[PDB]
C-alpha cells in the first residue's frame, strides 16, 4: 500500500470529519489489583506522551507497493485455492438488501455500534436512524443508495485501545478505515452468500477461521493440521498488500462464479480516504479496522502462503498444505518440514514483512506446545484429552481489565475475560476471581465459578 496523495478535503469538495480527541478508556476500579503496563493509544497531534510527529506515525504504515502484475507462482496459487473451494459449491446469487441488512444463516446483522461513514457522519445521521431490527425495514436504506450512490470515501478514526509504552511515544496507533454504509451494504449484498458459505465452514477446504467459536473449534483444529506445523507473523499486514494481491483475489472470485463483480475489489485497492480536514488516495493496502474486509484478507493469506511455497519450494503438493487464516494471523501445516526463515525472504519480494511466531527473534520450529492462534495457545484436557482448551495467557486478560470504556459494561466486559482466563485451569481461574472480589466493584459481579464453566464447556460440544 501506498499513498498517491493527500491534502486539504475542501480542496476536493469534502467537509472537514470532527472525530473524538479524547480515550474513553479510563482506570477501572481493578488498575492496582492486576499488574500492566499498556495505556491508550495517542489519538491527537498534541498528546504529551508523544516523542515523534504523529501524522507521519501513523500513515507510515504504507510501506509502498513492491510488486505490479501477477506472476507465475501467483496465477498458479490462484488455481489451487479457487479449485478448492469449488469443491463448497457456494451460491453465487446476489443477497437481497433486507439479509444484507439484518442478517440471515451465517450472516450477522450490521453492527448498529460502528460508524456509518461518509456523507452520515458529516449529517450526523445515525445508523439507528437508517434500520430497525424489529421491521427489517429496506425502505430507508434503499432510498439512501439511490441518493448517494457507492464507491464513496472511507472515514479514517485512530482506533481507541491499549497500546504499549513504546508505541505510545512512537505514535503507532492502529487506525480505522470505515467504508460507507452504502457501500458495506453494497458490499454484502454482493458477497453475502460467501461470507455466508465461509463462516459456516471454518477449517482448512476455505482456509479460513472468520465465524469461528474457539471453546469449539480448538477441538478440530489439530485433526486439520498435517505433520509438520509452521507459522510467522506480518508486519502491517493490510498496509503492506500491493495491488497485484487485489488482482489475484479477484482472479479467484472469478472463477468460483462471483465475477460479476469483481469491481468491488478495486474499491478496496484504489481506494480514497478521509481524516480530519484531509483527504488522500491511497494504491493498494486493504481497509483496516472494519470486519468486512477479514474474509478478503484471509483469502488473500492463502493465496499469499501458496504462492511463497511454490517460489520457494518447486515441486510442493499444495493439496497437503493444511492451513486456517483469520486475516494476517494463521496456523499451517504440511507432511514435511520448512523453513519459515526461507520463506520470510521470499515474503520480502512480494512486499511482506514477515517475521518469527509470537515475536521470537529467531525462526523456531512451531510445536503443538508453543504454537498460537488468535493470541491462544492449544492444551488438550487433563479428563478428556480429545478436547482441546483454547489458552490465552493471564497477561493479556490482565492488560484488559485494568481499563474500562463504560462502567455500565463493566458486568459484561469482566464476564468476557472470565470466559478466556478459565481455560489457565481452576487454580489460576480462582486467584483472579479471589482479586477481582477484592475490591467492591467485583464483589457485586455476577461471575461464573470454574467447575459450572467446565460443566459449560463440555455441554457446549
Ligand atoms: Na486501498
Known sequence: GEIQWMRPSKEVG????????????????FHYVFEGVKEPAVL???????????????????????????????????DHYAGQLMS???????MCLEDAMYGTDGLE??????????????????????????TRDTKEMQKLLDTYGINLPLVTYVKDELRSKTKVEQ??????????????????????NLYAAFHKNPGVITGSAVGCDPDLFWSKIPVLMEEKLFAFDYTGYDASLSPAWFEALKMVLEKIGFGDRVDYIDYLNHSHHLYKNKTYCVKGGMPSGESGTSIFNSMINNLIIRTLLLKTY???????????????????????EVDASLLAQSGKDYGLTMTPADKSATF????WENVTFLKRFFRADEKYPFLIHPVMPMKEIHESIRWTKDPRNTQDHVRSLCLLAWHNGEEEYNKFLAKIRSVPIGRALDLPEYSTLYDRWLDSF
Open 314 to 336: 518447486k515441486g510442493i503438493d499444495l493439496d497437503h498444505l493444511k492451513m486456517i487464516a483469520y486475516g494476517d494471523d494463521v496456523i499451517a501445516s504440511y507432511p514435511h
Open 364 to 367: 523456531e520450529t512451531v510445536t
Open 44 to 78: 491527537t497531534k498534541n498528546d504529551p506522551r508523544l516523542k515523534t510527529d504523529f501524522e507521519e506515525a501513523i500513515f507510515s504504515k504504507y510501506v509502498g507497493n513492491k510488486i505490479t502484475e501477477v506472476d507465475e507462482y501467483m496465477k498458479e496459487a490462484v
Open 14 to 29: 469534502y467537509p472537514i470529519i470532527n472525530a473524538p480527541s479524547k480515550t474513553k478508556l479510563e482506570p477501572s476500579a
Open 109 to 134: 446483522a450490521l453492527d448498529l455500534s460502528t460508524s456509518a461513514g461518509y456523507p452520515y457522519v458529516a449529517m450526523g445521521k445515525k445508523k439507528r436512524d437508517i434500520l430497525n431490527k424489529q
Open 171 to 192: 505514535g503507532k496507533s492502529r487506525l480505522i478505515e470505515a467504508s460507507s454504509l452504502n457501500d458495506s451494504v453494497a458490499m454484502r449484498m454482493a458477497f453475502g
Open 88 to 94: 463448497l459449491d457456494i451460491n453465487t446469487e446476489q
